[PDB]
Design an enzyme around this catalytic site. Structure first.
Site, PDB file in Angstrom:
ATOM      1  N   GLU A 105       0.627  -1.321  -0.056  1.00 49.09           N
ATOM      2  CA  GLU A 105      -0.474   0.026   0.500  1.00 49.09           C
ATOM      3  C   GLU A 105       0.960   0.832  -0.013  1.00 49.09           C
ATOM      4  OE1 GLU A 105      -3.309  -0.292   0.112  1.00 49.09           O
ATOM      5  OE2 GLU A 105      -4.027  -1.808   0.486  1.00 49.09           O
ATOM      6  N   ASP A 134      -4.480   8.399  -4.718  1.00 44.66           N
ATOM      7  CA  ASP A 134      -4.359   7.324  -4.897  1.00 44.66           C
ATOM      8  C   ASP A 134      -4.476   6.466  -6.366  1.00 44.66           C
ATOM      9  OD1 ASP A 134      -6.999   6.984  -5.917  1.00 44.66           O
ATOM     10  OD2 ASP A 134      -7.571   4.839  -4.524  1.00 44.66           O
ATOM     11  N   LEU A 174      -7.986   6.123   2.869  1.00 43.35           N
ATOM     12  CA  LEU A 174      -8.462   6.971   2.013  1.00 43.35           C
ATOM     13  C   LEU A 174      -9.223   7.613   2.870  1.00 43.35           C
ATOM     14  CD1 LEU A 174      -9.965   7.096  -0.734  1.00 43.35           C
ATOM     15  CD2 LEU A 174     -11.567   6.137  -0.341  1.00 43.35           C
ATOM     16  N   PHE A 205      -8.447  -5.364   4.208  1.00 43.44           N
ATOM     17  CA  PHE A 205      -7.720  -4.458   3.856  1.00 43.44           C
ATOM     18  C   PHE A 205      -7.942  -3.898   2.862  1.00 43.44           C
ATOM     19  CE2 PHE A 205      -4.522  -1.256   6.884  1.00 43.44           C
ATOM     20  CZ  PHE A 205      -4.376  -0.506   5.844  1.00 43.44           C
ATOM     21  N   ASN A 254      -8.242 -20.747  -9.001  1.00 47.09           N
ATOM     22  CA  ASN A 254      -8.928 -19.280  -8.843  1.00 47.09           C
ATOM     23  C   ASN A 254      -8.344 -18.239  -8.259  1.00 47.09           C
ATOM     24  OD1 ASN A 254     -12.407 -19.973  -7.189  1.00 47.09           O
ATOM     25  ND2 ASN A 254     -11.515 -20.507  -8.991  1.00 47.09           N
TER      26      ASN A 254
END
Ligand code: CU
Lengths: 163, 163
Positions: free
Chosen positions: A12, A21, A33, A105, A133
């Site tokens: 992040e 972002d 955010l 998260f 998957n």
């Protein structure tokens, strides 16, 4: 060594100054955010609320760390009160728990909960299967660098993808 | 490869068969209290409802981790709802968070909450002072080896006491 903080720091980023972002949204610290609003002042307003101080738009590592903890706490807490997620989470080993926490998260509890099949395989320690998957998801499509790391953490149960 | 799991494994042990703790209460995994009742049947019965099968009082490592994860969940969750604990919690780096968790795992959320002055020192990041203060507790006096480990963890923010 390695831990959810070092892992998410890597995924992040860690910034002490407000930044946009990849949707142009104002953010700070480790992927926090502030607001969707395009107003910089609304952003610093939300910042000052979160930090408890007139920051103008810059914070300290310590403030960024406290912020991060509050966010992780909120992910974990969301896992604990979600009956789809808690049992997979508890079935997991320490390293893979961090992977799951990573996903919550990023995309939030409700979203991670939407991964019904992968979650089953994972709880059933169908590691290889799960990794395949997960890779087909829209999540992977949008953030492949980050996703492969998380995914590979699920496959191996090691921190190999961050070391 | 060091985490809350490895840490408590060392502090509390990891046992695959039921056994009596100090006080002779039936126990398994990583200091997981099964029942206070004196019946080995009662202990097995509780054990089987927790794991999902007829265990005969013997579990695998994974299974013991499942159990450990449930106890850890409870400790943090308890910290999250405790006004006296969460703010100290959030002020702490990750290694130090495991130390606090350790403490809650051992003595309980209410007990740890009693360390009013040491928590404040922790929060304010007065490590040497916190360590010095915590040493003067009854906790130290009763379990000085484990406590010194935990305390040394707070003092340094490293895993060195477990290596
Ligand atoms: Cu709750």
């Amino acid at each position: 060594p390695m831990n959810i903080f070092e892992m998410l720091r890597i995924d992040e980023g860690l910034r002490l100054k407000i930044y946009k972002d990849t949707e142009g949204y104002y953010t700070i610290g480790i992927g926090h955010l502030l607001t969707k609003s395009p107003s910089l002042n609304a952003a610093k307003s939300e910042l000052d609320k979160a930090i408890g101080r007139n920051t103008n738009g810059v914070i300290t590592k310590d403030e960024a760390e406290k912020l991060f903890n509050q966010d992780v706490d909120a992910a974990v807490h969301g896992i604990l009160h979600n009956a789809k997620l808690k049992p997979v989470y508890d079935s997991l080993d320490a390293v893979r728990r961090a992977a799951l926490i990573n996903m919550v998260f990023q995309m939030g509890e409700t979203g991670v909960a939407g991964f019904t099949n992968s979650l089953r395989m994972l709880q059933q320690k169908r590691w290889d299967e799960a990794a395949v998957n997960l890779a087909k998801s829209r999540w992977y499509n949008q953030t492949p660098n980050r996703a492969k790391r998380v995914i590979t953490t699920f496959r191996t149960g090691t921190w190999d993808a961050y070391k």
